[PDB]
Design a protein around this ligand. Structure first.
Ligand SMILES: [Mg+2]
Ligand SMILES: [Zn+2]
Ligand SMILES: [Zn+2]
Lengths: 147, 136, 30, 49, 112, 43, 391, 262, 65, 56, 182, 56, 15
């Protein structure tokens, strides 16, 4: 999950080469889907990426505190001076054919956190395991081999 | 095999509406005062303007229906060696608006061609999968 | 100068002093 | 970095969540939507400190 | 359980060839070849070379599912052109390009 | 850990609504979702 | 699991490492989405059971939901968003790529359709390539507003023997629509075919989308300088509407129509103005935005969002509410200690005028918390009530 | 001839050049070779004897894996599965050991340089840890204070990045063609004008301007790729491209070879 | 917690770059953004790594073994 | 005018045209005798119920 | 803060000025000892303590220099003015109305409010480093993150949560794209 | 309720889900681990004896 | 307009 309630699991892991890459050879480590944004209106998650891309380049730390005068432009115009597109976009190439993507990509670092719900602590199956004592229906609880 | 219909067309108007690669054509025949044509045209492979004298053809086939496409080999004696722009498609409506003036509708994979005129010229064009050839 | 009115930014020092004297779990201790 | 605020019971950390309650020794005025003859009730939970 | 060792990832699995040339039904003188142990890096390279061939009618490939080092490839030549040997032509062409290119690259670097 | 040590509880007018007076005394955001919503607040 | 849909029989494809995988289009009937949701699977134990699954609870058979006699499953994701981009008139595909896309159709006959453009550079259009996945004999037409056999704005839809003729493929055509295409396939060629339809449409569009790409960025919410200014005029004019009404009430002038009090009537015009103002302002946003703007592409495809979302992101958050009314006076005559008493102006009673693009002020922000919270409590209650009632 | 090369600049571990007169697919296909399918040597197996650090065993063991070693003569070794050896052999692997002991009262940092070969090399130039810093120190492996010890023995094996990223001969691979968007392969998202907003690429000057005011050459193709390899340090850059081309040459040769099975 | 080996995205070996980086601030009092210019992580797939790393292992060593 | 109903007739007609390739500008080979009768002939096969009593 | 509407400057102004602000930071950067603490502010009566009931009969101005003195980028959020004059208190910093979990959210005022709630929920179950002595605690089901990282888009408050010293995640490089449909 | 109108069962599994466009609509991805655990009985018939024997 | 760290020496300058 990000820092904006966009929790989601991993779909699949792609190797380094197959991932899309910008002109500088930087392959993103994580890809999320656009359709999450308009419905949830989590604009902040976009800005943080925009701000962070500036912070890493310049060396500042993004003063992302809630109520300041920091506009988008102040980040945006600042970004332009570093030689990247003002809105955080970036030309990117498909990793399969190495052909320019017809559309640009929003890109940049963003804080991500790992959550407890690992798959290995949620998956189980049962084929004629132990039953209860009172009712002789199968027991509950994956730890105790539930049903 | 034979040109199902041919005429020389002057663009009464071009509408470059709303898009980057396609536009509208307002063609009025100098030859006949009643054959008006509207057709989507790709600007990139055929830039246009007002009052452009354009040859228009139909050409049900190119020989000089169970035919998988293949690239031309070398100077093969197909048509459009005299023309410059070719689109393949198929009509989907015959409409008789009025007196023997008859109008037709063709779609070239999303590119649409509306052509109208008297009956006697347009008898021979009956819903066949047609080509389209343009020069000048 | 020292008599001039303060800007918004200076309040963080106050907040930093506030946490320095109290800490986050004051009331539990208090 | 640990800052206390919690007791240790038989080797287990425990925390007393703050509890909430209405004010003591305070008068309050309530209506009564019910058809009960008491239109308004001026409740007060008194207490000795 | 399920996760394979990685010599079978690129070296041939036992008993079966690295490729499976399969006669096709849709078109005469057309074929499908199943390349095991390899993926895009080899695949898309092969496909582009084929298009150079004039006598080739149809040539495309796809990767079935991202979990495997396999991908299909469908080649359709004109009549009187064996796809196997039609494929054979492509490989020599590429290696000749590479073999030249390494020499060409060596030259520039060796001039430093 | 820190949030836990600053957690409030409330046994069961309508308390779940974020009341105007809650301004700057309890967090207008941090509240567990579900059976506890509104009932559990944090300073 | 409160549908007959919510349980369906599948076919097992054993796979590598430990998750459950399913086709994307089936995510709708389950109301499932990979936010970490878990799903149980059951294995029959007898031939009679197995048949009773594969012959009654078959995923293809559940396509036409008897709940509302319209398809419950459709092409609903990026695939939907992507396919719209594939069906524009401006879209074209070169031969080299057209071969792979064709190959992706598992049941493709083995024929290369003649490109819609030759001389020069034989070129294809998405509509034809898309038509390959559509089985032959399918016929369907939709004549929306402004529809014409000429189709100037390319609305509507028309297919003939599995060949798109004009129209832009979108939710209103391939989504879960009453007269949608997927509805027709089921009735015409049975449901069994219609399963193959998903297997074709998806892999094609996804493959093409993967090589055309699609993304959204901050700029997608940015409005033009002029448009932002026009928005401000729209907001300001609303205040004047409010201001005059406010004083009229203070002069004992406003006359409530029969059936509600003066304050009751007074609130009606106030709220109606603010909602009008926002919705009028949102119109400024949606009209202005370039067709390149992705969030307008997604909205037009219908795959996510709506008009309201882009209105709040770009134009204005609008008026918060509680119990249908504005933010009442929690304190004495005033909503917050930051205001003087008796302030019915919209920014005091709980109207946010800023937009998510440029953040909210505290007073505004705090209000939005209450308005946001009220949904959570309600959503919690609806889970409590609706679930019980349904039982 | 065939495709052409031209070097612009070359550092100790970076090389920039311009690959011209070659199909787009091969250029990309070359890229994917360099990133993943190149042989390389890295620590594979660890057997911790004494650990008293504030760090987990596998933690330290994992970091040991990501330590680059000199691997010029990697071909002079045998793939781990190919040997009939008993879990390793001098011709199959390189055995590395490390003894670290905090003795100074201030913290004693453990560096890559403290690794030592404890096996025969047969004169190979492989197994030496790469020291890319000028200051002779290795990569900071672990910090120790007096009273802590670290005795372990690593085993380095010939691996390929496609398995794990440790065997990665290369780092970020810059890659670009058609700096001016004259091939129309991309539509520039813009608010007022793409040109004012999208900065020009560093290589836009190296090719002629778009020469606006002319029809777009629809039948033109793509060449003149501006790649830039950046070796991590295991092998010099010149090898990377050369060995990458070599490997790609091998695989296609393998197809043609396997094709002869009839 | 201690100077991660090569940056996840790029892969430029970054472990040796740490102490030099630390040497800069306590001695030359550079700005970090200017520092890395002197340091040589000109890309930003690494320029993140040193910038936002936490050196927790230092506080770990405060515990007598 | 729109009400949810059983089998669609609009769509059925379309298939007929596209199946038989209706050659317009032609006289139909139908008889008015057949049309009216055929409709009434068909209407006695739409058997929701199978019984034979008056009630059914 | 305590507002003194009486002032020779012709308008309201705070009882706190640069001097104390200077003095406050002086105490911090000592690490000669004077320790001019927070309590000294209360002892000087520059900042007041207020409960809910006391809030009933006061007039709190939002930002000090934004409103206390009497009397343009559209991208700046539109605010209200200081038409009112009879203030008594000004908020120390409006961002402090949030809790512990909430404060970590970058740009929360740029979010749909329920989203903030969700982050505050998950943020409690964010894998990280809970204490620096985890090697001697024998607790059940402890979780430690291999290579933590301070967030790039930090928050002014976050420094006061020691978050920069005990982070709970990594700065991943994320590209938003319908790339492979997965 | 808890034991007649609803009861636990064997031959069932639960885990997390994940999309995959490359599956036929009526399919489902199942981890090979579960497949090795869950099982469905089959009858020894002449048509499948050898195959079933092979599985043994 | 970002965070700051180096204002401390001004106090020494103020001293
Ligand atoms: Mg869910
Ligand atoms: Zn060996
Ligand atoms: Zn890097």
């Amino acid at each position: 999950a990000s820092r904006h309630g966009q929790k989601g699991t991993i779909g699949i892991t792609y190797r380094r080469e197959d991932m899309p890459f910008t002109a500088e050879g930087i392959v993103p480590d994580l890809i999320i889907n656009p359709h999450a944004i308009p419905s949830r209106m989590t604009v902040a998650h976009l800005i943080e990426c925009l701000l962070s891309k500036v912070a890493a380049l310049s060396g500042n730390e993004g003063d992302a505190s809630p109520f300041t005068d920091i506009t988008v432009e102040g980040i945006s115009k600042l970004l332009r001076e570093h030689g990247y597109q003002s809105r955080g976009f970036e030309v990117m190439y498909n990793g399969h054919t190495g052909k320019k993507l017809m559309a640009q990509i929003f890109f940049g670092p963003t804080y991500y956190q790992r959550l407890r719900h690992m798959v290995d602590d949620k998956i189980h199956a049962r084929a004629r395991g132990p039953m209860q004592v009172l009712t002789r229906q199968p027991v509950e609880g994956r730890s105790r081999d539930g049903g | 095999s034979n040109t199902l219909f041919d005429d020389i067309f002057q663009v009464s108007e071009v509408d470059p509406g709303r898009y980057n690669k396609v536009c509208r054509i307002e063609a009025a025949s100098t030859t006949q005062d009643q054959c008006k044509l509207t057709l989507d045209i790709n600007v990139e492979l055929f830039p246009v303007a007002a009052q452009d004298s354009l040859t228009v053809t139909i050409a049900s086939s190119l020989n000089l229906a169970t035919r998988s496409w293949r690239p031309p080999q070398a100077g093969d004696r197909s048509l459009a060696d005299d023309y410059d722009y070719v689109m393949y498609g198929t009509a989907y409506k015959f409409e008789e608006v009025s007196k023997d003036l008859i109008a037709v509708y063709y779609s070239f994979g999303g590119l649409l061609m509306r052509l109208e005129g008297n009956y006697r010229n347009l008898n021979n064009l009956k819903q066949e999968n047609a080509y389209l050839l343009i020069r000048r | 100068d020292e008599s001039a009115p303060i800007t918004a930014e200076d309040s963080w020092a106050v907040i930093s002093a506030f946490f320095r004297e109290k800490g986050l779990v004051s009331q539990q201790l208090d | 970095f640990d800052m206390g605020g919690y007791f240790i019971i038989n080797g287990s950390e425990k925390v007393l969540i703050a509890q909430e309650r209405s004010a003591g020794n305070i008068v309050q005025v309530f209506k009564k939507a019910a058809p009960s003859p008491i239109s308004h009730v001026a409740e007060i939970r008194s207490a000795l400190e | 359980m399920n996760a394979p060792d990685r010599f079978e990832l690129f070296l041939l699995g036992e008993g079966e060839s690295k490729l499976k040339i399969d006669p096709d039904t849709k078109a005469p003188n057309a074929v499908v070849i199943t390349f095991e142990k390899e993926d895009h890096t080899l695949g898309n390279l092969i496909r582009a070379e084929l298009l150079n061939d004039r006598k080739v009618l149809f040539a495309a490939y796809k990767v079935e599912h991202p979990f495997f080092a396999r991908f299909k490839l469908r080649i359709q030549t004109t009549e009187g052109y064996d796809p196997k040997d039609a494929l054979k032509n492509a490989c020599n062409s590429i290696i000749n390009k590479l073999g030249a290119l390494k020499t060409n690259f060596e030259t520039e670097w060796n001039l430093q | 850990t820190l949030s836990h040590l600053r957690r409030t509880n409330t046994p069961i007018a309508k308390p779940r609504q974020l009341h105007n007076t809650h301004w700057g005394l309890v967090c207008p955001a941090e509240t567990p979702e579900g059976q506890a919503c509104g009932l559990v607040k944090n300073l | 699991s409160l549908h007959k849909m919510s349980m369906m029989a599948h076919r097992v494809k054993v796979i590598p490492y430990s998750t459950f995988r399913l086709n994307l289009s089936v995510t709708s009937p389950y109301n499932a989405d990979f936010d970490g949701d878990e799903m149980n699977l059951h294995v029959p134990q007898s031939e009679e059971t197995r048949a009773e699954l594969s012959q009654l609870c078959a995923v293809p058979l559940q396509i036409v939901s008897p709940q509302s006699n319209k398809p419950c499953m459709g092409i609903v994701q990026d695939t939907l968003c992507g396919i719209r981009k594939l069906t524009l008139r401006d879209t074209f595909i070169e031969l080299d790529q057209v071969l792979n896309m064709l190959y992706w159709v598992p049941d493709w006959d083995g024929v290369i359709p003649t490109p819609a453009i030759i001389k020069p550079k034989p070129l294809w259009s998405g509509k034809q390539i898309l038509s390959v996945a559509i089985p032959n004999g399918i016929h369907l037409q939709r004549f929306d507003e402004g529809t014409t056999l000429l189709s100037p704005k390319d609305n509507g839809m028309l297919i003939i023997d599995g060949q798109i003729i004009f129209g832009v493929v979108e939710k209103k055509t391939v989504g879960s629509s009453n007269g949608g295409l997927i509805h027709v396939v089921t009735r015409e060629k049975g449901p069994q075919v219609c399963a193959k339809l998903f297997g074709n449409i998806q892999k094609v569009v996804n493959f093409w989308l993967l090589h055309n790409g699609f993304s959204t960025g901050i700029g997608d919410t940015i409005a033009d300088g002029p448009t932002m200014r026009e928005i401000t005029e729209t907001i300001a004019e609303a205040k004047k509407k409010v201001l005059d009404v406010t004083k009229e009430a203070q002069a004992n002038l406003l006359t409530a129509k029969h059936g509600m009090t003066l304050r009751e009537s007074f609130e009606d015009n106030v709220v109606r103005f603010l909602n009008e103002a926002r919705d009028k302002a949102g119109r400024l946003a949606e009209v202005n935005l370039k067709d390149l703007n992705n969030v307008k592409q997604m909205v037009m495809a219908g795959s996510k969002g709506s008009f309201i979302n882009i209105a709040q992101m770009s134009a204005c958050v609008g008026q918060q509410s509680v119990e249908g009314k504005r933010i009442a006076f929690g304190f004495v005559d005033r909503t917050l200690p930051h205001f003087s008493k008796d302030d019915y102006s919209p920014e005091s009673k709980g109207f946010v005028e800023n937009s998510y693009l440029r953040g909210l002020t505290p007073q505004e922000f705090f209000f939005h918390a209450m308005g946001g919270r009220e949904g959570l409590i309600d959503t919690a209650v609806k889970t409590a009530e609706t679930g019980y009632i349904q039982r | 001839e065939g495709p052409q090369v031209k070097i612009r600049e070359a550092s100790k571990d970076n090389v920039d050049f311009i690959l011209s007169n070659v199909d787009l697919a091969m250029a990309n296909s070359l890229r994917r070779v360099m990133i993943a399918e190149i042989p390389t040597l890295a620590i594979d197996s660890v057997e911790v004897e004494t650990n008293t650090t504030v760090l987990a065993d596998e933690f330290i063991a994992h970091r040991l894996g990501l330590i680059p070693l000199q691997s010029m003569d990697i071909e002079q070794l045998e793939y781990s599965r190919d040997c009939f050896c008993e879990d390793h052999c001098d011709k199959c692997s390189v055995v590395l050991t490390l003894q670290a002991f905090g003795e100074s009262e201030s913290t004693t940092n453990v560096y890559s340089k403290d690794l030592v070969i404890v096996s025969n090399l047969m004169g190979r130039n492989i197994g030496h840890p790469i020291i890319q810093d000028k200051e002779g120190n290795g990569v900071l492996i672990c910090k120790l204070r007096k009273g802590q010890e670290l005795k372990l023995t690593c085993v380095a094996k010939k691996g390929i990045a496609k398995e794990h990223a440790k065997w990665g001969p290369a780092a970020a691979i810059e890659f670009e063609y058609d700096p001016w968007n004259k091939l129309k392969h991309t539509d520039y998202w813009y608010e007022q004008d793409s040109a004012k907003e999208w900065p020009q690429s560093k290589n836009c000057e190296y090719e002629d301007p778009p020469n606006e005011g002319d029809p777009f050459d629809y039948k033109a193709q793509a060449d003149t790729f501006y790649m830039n390899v950046e070796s991590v340090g295991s092998i010099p850059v010149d090898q990377v491209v050369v060995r990458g081309i070599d490997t790609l040459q091998k695989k296609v040769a393998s197809i043609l070879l396997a094709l002869t099975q009839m | 917690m201690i100077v991660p080996v090569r940056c996840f995205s790029c892969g430029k070996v970054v472990g040796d770059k740490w102490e030099s980086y630390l040497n800069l601030l306590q001695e030359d009092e550079l700005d970090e953004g200017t520092a890395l210019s002197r340091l040589g992580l000109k890309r930003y797939c690494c320029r993140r790594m040193i910038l936002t790393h936490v050196d927790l292992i230092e506080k770990f060593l405060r515990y007598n073994p | 005018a729109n009400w949810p109903l059983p089998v669609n007739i609009r769509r059925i007609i379309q298939n007929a045209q596209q199946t038989f390739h209706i050659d317009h500008t032609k006289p139909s080979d139908l008889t008015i005798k057949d049309i009216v009768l055929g409709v009434k002939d068909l209407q006695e096969n739409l058997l929701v119920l199978r019984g034979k009593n008056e009630i059914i | 803060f305590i507002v003194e509407d009486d002032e020779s400057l012709g308008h309201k102004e705070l009882k706190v000025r640069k001097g104390h602000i200077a003095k406050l930071m002086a105490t911090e950067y000592q690490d000669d000892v004077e320790e001019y603490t927070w309590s000294s502010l209360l002892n000087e009566g520059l900042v007041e303590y207020i409960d809910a009931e006391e809030e009933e009969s006061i007039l709190i101005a939002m930002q000090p220099e934004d409103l206390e003195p009497a009397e343009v980028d559209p991208a700046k959020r539109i605010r209200v003015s200081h038409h009112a004059t009879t203030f008594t208190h000004c908020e120390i910093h409006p961002s402090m109305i949030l809790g512990v979990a909430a404060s970590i959210i970058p740009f929360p005022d740029h979010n749909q409010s329920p989203r903030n709630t969700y982050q505050s929920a998950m943020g409690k179950q964010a894998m990280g480093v809970f204490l620096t002595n985890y090697n001697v605690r024998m607790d059940t089901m402890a979780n430690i993150l291999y290579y933590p990282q301070k967030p790039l888009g930090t928050t002014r408050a976050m420094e006061y949560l020691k978050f920069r010293e005990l982070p709970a995640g990594q700065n991943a490089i994320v590209a938003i794209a319908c790339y492979s449909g997965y | 309720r808890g034991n007649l109108m609803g009861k636990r069962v064997d031959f069932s599994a639960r885990t997390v889900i994940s999309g995959d466009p490359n599956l036929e609509l009526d399919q489902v991805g199942v981890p090979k681990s579960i497949a090795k655990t869950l099982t469905y009985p089959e009858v020894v018939t002449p048509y499948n004896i050898d195959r079933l024997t092979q599985l043994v | 307009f970002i965070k700051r760290d180096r204002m401390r020496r001004n106090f020494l300058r103020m001293r």
